[PDB]
Design an enzyme around this catalytic site. Structure first.
Site, PDB file in Angstrom:
ATOM      1  N   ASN A 125       0.160  -2.824  -9.513  1.00 38.08           N
ATOM      2  CA  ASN A 125       1.527  -2.933  -9.048  1.00 38.08           C
ATOM      3  C   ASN A 125       1.607  -3.961  -7.929  1.00 38.08           C
ATOM      4  O   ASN A 125       0.594  -4.524  -7.534  1.00 38.08           O
ATOM      5  CB  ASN A 125       2.096  -1.553  -8.645  1.00 38.08           C
ATOM      6  CG  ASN A 125       1.739  -1.129  -7.235  1.00 38.08           C
ATOM      7  OD1 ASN A 125       0.858  -1.689  -6.598  1.00 38.08           O
ATOM      8  ND2 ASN A 125       2.435  -0.109  -6.745  1.00 38.08           N
ATOM      9  N   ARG A 140       6.262  13.289   6.537  1.00 39.82           N
ATOM     10  CA  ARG A 140       7.648  13.230   6.105  1.00 39.82           C
ATOM     11  C   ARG A 140       8.622  12.968   7.255  1.00 39.82           C
ATOM     12  O   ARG A 140       9.634  12.321   7.046  1.00 39.82           O
ATOM     13  CB  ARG A 140       8.050  14.547   5.435  1.00 39.82           C
ATOM     14  CG  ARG A 140       7.960  14.538   3.933  1.00 39.82           C
ATOM     15  CD  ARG A 140       6.602  15.005   3.493  1.00 39.82           C
ATOM     16  NE  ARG A 140       6.569  15.223   2.055  1.00 39.82           N
ATOM     17  CZ  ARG A 140       6.235  16.373   1.483  1.00 39.82           C
ATOM     18  NH1 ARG A 140       5.915  17.423   2.230  1.00 39.82           N
ATOM     19  NH2 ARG A 140       6.220  16.469   0.162  1.00 39.82           N
ATOM     20  N   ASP A 155      12.401   5.999  10.581  1.00 37.79           N
ATOM     21  CA  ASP A 155      12.511   7.025   9.563  1.00 37.79           C
ATOM     22  C   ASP A 155      13.881   7.697   9.608  1.00 37.79           C
ATOM     23  O   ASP A 155      14.261   8.289  10.617  1.00 37.79           O
ATOM     24  CB  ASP A 155      11.383   8.025   9.819  1.00 37.79           C
ATOM     25  CG  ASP A 155      10.962   8.754   8.580  1.00 37.79           C
ATOM     26  OD1 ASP A 155      10.552   8.037   7.643  1.00 37.79           O
ATOM     27  OD2 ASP A 155      10.997   9.999   8.525  1.00 37.79           O
ATOM     28  N   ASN A 192      13.865   5.603   2.372  1.00 40.59           N
ATOM     29  CA  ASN A 192      13.174   6.496   3.297  1.00 40.59           C
ATOM     30  C   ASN A 192      13.288   6.025   4.728  1.00 40.59           C
ATOM     31  O   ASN A 192      13.202   6.830   5.663  1.00 40.59           O
ATOM     32  CB  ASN A 192      11.687   6.599   2.936  1.00 40.59           C
ATOM     33  CG  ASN A 192      10.855   7.235   4.044  1.00 40.59           C
ATOM     34  OD1 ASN A 192      10.872   8.444   4.226  1.00 40.59           O
ATOM     35  ND2 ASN A 192      10.119   6.416   4.786  1.00 40.59           N
ATOM     36  N   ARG A 244       4.672   0.280 -17.499  1.00 40.64           N
ATOM     37  CA  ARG A 244       5.294  -0.791 -16.740  1.00 40.64           C
ATOM     38  C   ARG A 244       4.347  -1.987 -16.682  1.00 40.64           C
ATOM     39  O   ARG A 244       3.172  -1.850 -16.322  1.00 40.64           O
ATOM     40  CB  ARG A 244       5.601  -0.364 -15.309  1.00 40.64           C
ATOM     41  CG  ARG A 244       6.150  -1.515 -14.476  1.00 40.64           C
ATOM     42  CD  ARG A 244       6.487  -1.090 -13.069  1.00 40.64           C
ATOM     43  NE  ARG A 244       5.302  -0.612 -12.364  1.00 40.64           N
ATOM     44  CZ  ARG A 244       5.338   0.074 -11.227  1.00 40.64           C
ATOM     45  NH1 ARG A 244       6.505   0.395 -10.666  1.00 40.64           N
ATOM     46  NH2 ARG A 244       4.204   0.468 -10.669  1.00 40.64           N
ATOM     47  N   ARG A 268      13.535   3.079  -8.893  1.00 40.71           N
ATOM     48  CA  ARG A 268      12.211   3.342  -8.406  1.00 40.71           C
ATOM     49  C   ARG A 268      12.409   3.847  -6.993  1.00 40.71           C
ATOM     50  O   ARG A 268      13.048   3.164  -6.204  1.00 40.71           O
ATOM     51  CB  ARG A 268      11.362   2.060  -8.376  1.00 40.71           C
ATOM     52  CG  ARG A 268      10.000   2.239  -7.666  1.00 40.71           C
ATOM     53  CD  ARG A 268       9.470   0.928  -7.086  1.00 40.71           C
ATOM     54  NE  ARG A 268       8.149   1.101  -6.489  1.00 40.71           N
ATOM     55  CZ  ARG A 268       7.908   1.061  -5.182  1.00 40.71           C
ATOM     56  NH1 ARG A 268       8.905   0.887  -4.318  1.00 40.71           N
ATOM     57  NH2 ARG A 268       6.670   1.225  -4.735  1.00 40.71           N
ATOM     58  N   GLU A 322       7.659   6.703  -6.224  1.00 41.90           N
ATOM     59  CA  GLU A 322       6.386   6.181  -5.762  1.00 41.90           C
ATOM     60  C   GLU A 322       5.649   7.233  -4.944  1.00 41.90           C
ATOM     61  O   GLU A 322       5.922   7.424  -3.762  1.00 41.90           O
ATOM     62  CB  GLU A 322       6.593   4.927  -4.901  1.00 41.90           C
ATOM     63  CG  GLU A 322       5.309   4.120  -4.663  1.00 41.90           C
ATOM     64  CD  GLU A 322       5.171   3.597  -3.239  1.00 41.90           C
ATOM     65  OE1 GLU A 322       5.927   4.030  -2.350  1.00 41.90           O
ATOM     66  OE2 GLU A 322       4.300   2.741  -3.001  1.00 41.90           O
ATOM     67  N   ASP A 340      11.094   4.259  -3.585  1.00 41.48           N
ATOM     68  CA  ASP A 340      10.028   3.790  -2.708  1.00 41.48           C
ATOM     69  C   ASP A 340       9.629   4.836  -1.670  1.00 41.48           C
ATOM     70  O   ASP A 340      10.469   5.588  -1.178  1.00 41.48           O
ATOM     71  CB  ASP A 340      10.501   2.520  -2.010  1.00 41.48           C
ATOM     72  CG  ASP A 340       9.488   1.967  -1.074  1.00 41.48           C
ATOM     73  OD1 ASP A 340       8.497   1.391  -1.547  1.00 41.48           O
ATOM     74  OD2 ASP A 340       9.679   2.102   0.143  1.00 41.48           O
ATOM     75  N   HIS A 350       6.852  10.175   1.429  1.00 45.25           N
ATOM     76  CA  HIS A 350       7.279  10.289   2.819  1.00 45.25           C
ATOM     77  C   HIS A 350       8.626  10.973   2.961  1.00 45.25           C
ATOM     78  O   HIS A 350       9.147  11.109   4.063  1.00 45.25           O
ATOM     79  CB  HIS A 350       7.279   8.908   3.463  1.00 45.25           C
ATOM     80  CG  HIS A 350       5.915   8.299   3.509  1.00 45.25           C
ATOM     81  ND1 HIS A 350       4.982   8.660   4.453  1.00 45.25           N
ATOM     82  CD2 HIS A 350       5.278   7.478   2.641  1.00 45.25           C
ATOM     83  CE1 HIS A 350       3.825   8.092   4.164  1.00 45.25           C
ATOM     84  NE2 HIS A 350       3.978   7.369   3.068  1.00 45.25           N
TER      85      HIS A 350
HETATM   86 CA   LIG Z   1      10.475  10.098   6.043  1.00 44.26          CA
HETATM   87 CL   LIG Z   2       5.215   1.537  -7.819  1.00 47.03          CL
END
Ligand SMILES: [Ca+2]
Ligand SMILES: [Cl-]
Ligand SMILES: OC[C@H]1O[C@H](O[C@H]2[C@H](O)[C@@H](O)[C@@H](O)O[C@@H]2CO)[C@H](O)[C@@H](O)[C@@H]1O
Length: 496
Positions: free
Chosen positions: A298, A158, A167, A100, A337, A195, A233, A197, A201
Site C-alpha cells: 500500500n 484512541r 486528535d 481521526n 486492491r 477508506r 485501515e 484512515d 485510533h
Molecule cells: Ca483518536
Molecule cells: Cl490501506
C-alpha cells in the site's frame, strides 16, 4: 458496508496514489472501463496543510485543515467532473477519508493550506470547518506527552495524539456531524465508498455513530438502498489489545498480514515456501474472507511507513512483485486492491530511506500530468503498475473466474505450484531454482489458450505463449527458473 458496489464482473480496485482528478477521469474512460477495473481509491480530496519542510511530502495530505474539496489533485469542480465521468463509464470512486485527526499540533498558524484557509493548531482553531479547542481530545488523553506512548493501552491509542496529530473528539455529536456532512457531500456527488484512515485510533463505536448519519448512494448510479462500501485501515499483526474483529460491524478491514506473509513467502525468507500456500487465507490466521480487503503493498508500507516490514514487495522488485500480485488476483481470498505508484529517489542511509517523504512528480509543487507513452506505459515518473500487461491481464483473470472454486492444486513440495478456478482458469508458478516441465490437469475444456502473462489474445491470435489443452484437460507447461516472468496464466476468455 461490505459490498464494493462495483459493476457486475469487476472484482478489483486500484489506488491511483496522488493522481490529479483530471487524470483519473481520463484514465477511467480510456483505460479502466475497457480493461475491466472495478474502481479507484483516490487520495484525500479535502484541504490539507501545505508543508514546505520537507517540500510538499505525500503525507501532508493526512493533515486536514478543512473539508473543502481543494487539493493539489484539483478543486471541487474537477472532483465532481471525475466522479461523474468515471461512474458513467462504470468505474467507482472510493475516497480516502481522514477523519481521526486534523494537523500536527506543532504546525504554525497561518494560511499555509492547499486552499488558503486560515488555521491555528496551537489554539486548536480551524475556522474553515469550524472546530475549536472544544472539539479535540486534549483533555481526554491521559499521557504526559499528549501523544500515544504505549500501544498496549487501547485507551490512549484512541484518545491521544497519533504522532502529534490533533486528535478529534469523535464522541461529540457536533464533531460526528461535521464529518458526516463532509462525507455526505461526497456520497451525493457519486462516491461508492470510503477508506477509513487510522481506524485503529478511533473507537469502533464512534465510527458507527458517524456511519449512521450517512446517506444512501446516489440513486442515478446505484440501486435504491445501497450503502457506501466501507474498509477501515486497521494495522493488526499479532498480539495487540486491539483486534481487527472489533471493527467487523462497520465494514471490511485491511488485512495487513496478507502482504507481509506473502512477501516473505515469495522471497523465500525464514524457511517459507510456495507449497505452503495450499491453505492460504483463513488457514493462515487471516480475518474471514468476507471482511477482508487485501493487497500486496500500500502507499504507507511500500516506502517503509508501516505494517509489513522488510518482506513487503513493491514495483521496485518488479519480477517478484508481479508474481505476488498474480497469486493474489488468482486466489479467491478477499477483495483485492491494486497499487499504482510514482517513482521517487530512494536514498538509503543505514537501511532506511531518507527520501520516503518525497511527494508526487511535480514542478515547484504543481503535480505533473500523467503522460501515456505510445507503448501504453506512463511517463513523468508515474509507475502505473495497473498498466503492466501481467497485472492488467490478472485483473481480467479474476473477473473471469469469479465465484469459481479453488481446485486442481499441485505442488512439488518446494516452490513449484499450480491451481485452477473451477473450469474457468488455470495458473502455474515456478519459484524454484530449476526449470518446471510437467503435464498438468487443468480442469479446462480442450483447446488452444493464450498465456495472458507473456501476451494477449487479439482477434484469433496470441501475441505471447500458447498452451494446448487436450480432451482430458491436461496441458504441458514449461517454465525456466530464469524466465522473465516465471508464471503462466490461462482462462476461458483467453481461449482461441
Ligand atoms: Ca483518536
Ligand atoms: Cl490501506
Ligand atoms: O505530527 C505530524 C507528524 O507528521 C508526519 O507524520 C505522518 C506519518 O509519517 C505518515 O506515515 C502518515 O501517517 O501521516 C502522518 C501525518 O502527516 C511526520 O512524519 C511526523 O514525524 C510528525 O510528527
Amino acid at each position: 458496508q461490505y459490498s464494493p458496489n462495483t459493476q457486475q464482473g469487476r472484482t478489483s480496485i486500484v489506488h491511483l496514489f496522488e493522481w490529479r482528478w483530471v487524470d483519473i477521469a481520463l484514465e477511467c474512460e480510456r483505460y479502466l472501463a475497457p480493461k475491466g477495473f472495478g474502481g479507484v481509491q483516490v487520495s484525500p480530496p479535502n484541504e490539507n496543510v501545505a508543508i514546505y519542510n520537507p517540500f510538499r511530502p505525500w503525507w501532508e495530505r493526512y493533515q486536514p485543515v478543512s473539508y473543502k474539496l481543494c487539493t493539489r489533485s484539483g478543486n471541487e469542480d474537477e472532483f465532481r467532473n471525475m466522479v461523474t465521468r468515471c461512474n458513467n463509464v462504470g468505474v467507482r470512486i472510493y475516497v480516502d477519508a481522514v477523519i481521526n485527526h486534523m494537523c500536527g499540533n506543532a504546525v504554525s498558524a497561518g494560511t499555509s493550506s492547499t486552499c488558503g484557509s486560515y488555521f491555528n493548531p496551537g489554539s486548536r482553531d480551524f475556522p474553515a470547518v469550524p472546530y475549536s479547542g472544544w472539539d479535540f481530545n486534549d483533555g481526554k488523553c491521559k499521557t504526559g506527552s499528549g501523544d500515544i506512548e504505549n500501544y498496549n493501552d487501547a485507551t490512549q491509542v484512541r484518545d491521544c495524539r497519533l504522532t502529534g496529530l490533533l486528535d478529534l473528539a469523535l464522541e461529540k455529536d457536533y464533531v460526528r456531524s461535521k464529518i458526516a456532512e463532509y462525507m455526505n457531500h461526497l456520497i451525493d456527488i457519486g462516491v461508492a465508498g470510503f477508506r477509513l484512515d487510522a481506524s485503529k485510533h478511533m473507537w469502533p463505536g464512534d465510527i458507527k455513530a458517524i456511519l449512521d448519519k450517512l446517506h444512501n448512494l446516489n440513486s442515478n448510479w446505484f440501486p435504491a438502498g445501497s450503502k457506501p462500501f466501507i474498509y477501515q485501515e486497521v494495522i493488526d499483526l499479532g498480539g495487540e489489545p486491539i483486534k481487527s474483529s472489533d471493527y467487523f460491524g462497520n465494514g471490511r478491514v485491511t488485512e495487513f498480514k496478507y502482504g507481509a506473509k506473502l512477501g516473505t513467502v515469495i522471497r523465500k525468507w525464514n524457511g517459507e515456501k510456495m507449497s505452503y500456500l495450499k491453505n492460504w487465507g483463513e488457514g493462515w490466521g487471516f480475518v474471514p474472507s468476507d471482511r477482508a480487503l487485501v493487497f500486496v503493498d500500500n502507499h504507507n508500507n511500500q516506502r517503509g511507513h508501516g505494517a509489513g516490514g522488510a518482506s513487503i514487495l513493491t514495483f521496485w522488485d518488479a519480477r517478484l512483485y508481479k508474481m505476488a500480485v498474480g497469486f493474489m488476483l488468482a486466489h479467491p481470498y478477499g477483495f483485492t486492491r491494486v497499487m499504482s505508484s510514482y517513482r521517487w529517489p530512494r536514498q538509503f542511509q543505514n537501511g532506511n530511506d531518507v527520501n520516503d517523504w518525497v511527494g508526487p512528480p511535480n514542478n515547484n509543487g504543481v503535480i505533473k500530468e500523467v503522460t501515456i507513452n505510445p507503448d501504453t506505459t506512463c511517463g513523468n515518473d508515474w509507475v502505473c503498475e495497473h498498466r503492466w500487461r501481467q497485472i492488467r491481464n490478472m485483473v481480467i483473470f479474476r473477473n473471469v473466474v469469479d465465484g469459481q472454486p479453488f481446485t486442481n492444486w499441485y505442488d512439488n513440495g518446494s516452490n513449484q505450484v499450480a491451481f485452477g478456478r473451477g473450469n474457468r482458469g488455470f495458473i502455474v508458478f515456478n519459484n524454484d531454482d530449476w526449470s518446471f516441465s510437467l503435464t498438468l490437469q487443468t480442469g479446462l475444456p480442450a483447446g488452444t489458450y493464450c498465456d495472458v502473462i507473456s501476451g494477449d489474445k487479439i482477434n484469433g491470435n496470441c501475441t505471447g505463449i500458447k498452451i494446448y489443452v487436450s480432451d482430458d484437460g491436461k496441458a504441458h507447461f514449461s517454465i525456466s527458473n530464469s524466465a522473465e516472468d516465471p508464471f503462466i496464466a490461462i482462462h476461458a476468455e483467453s481461449k482461441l
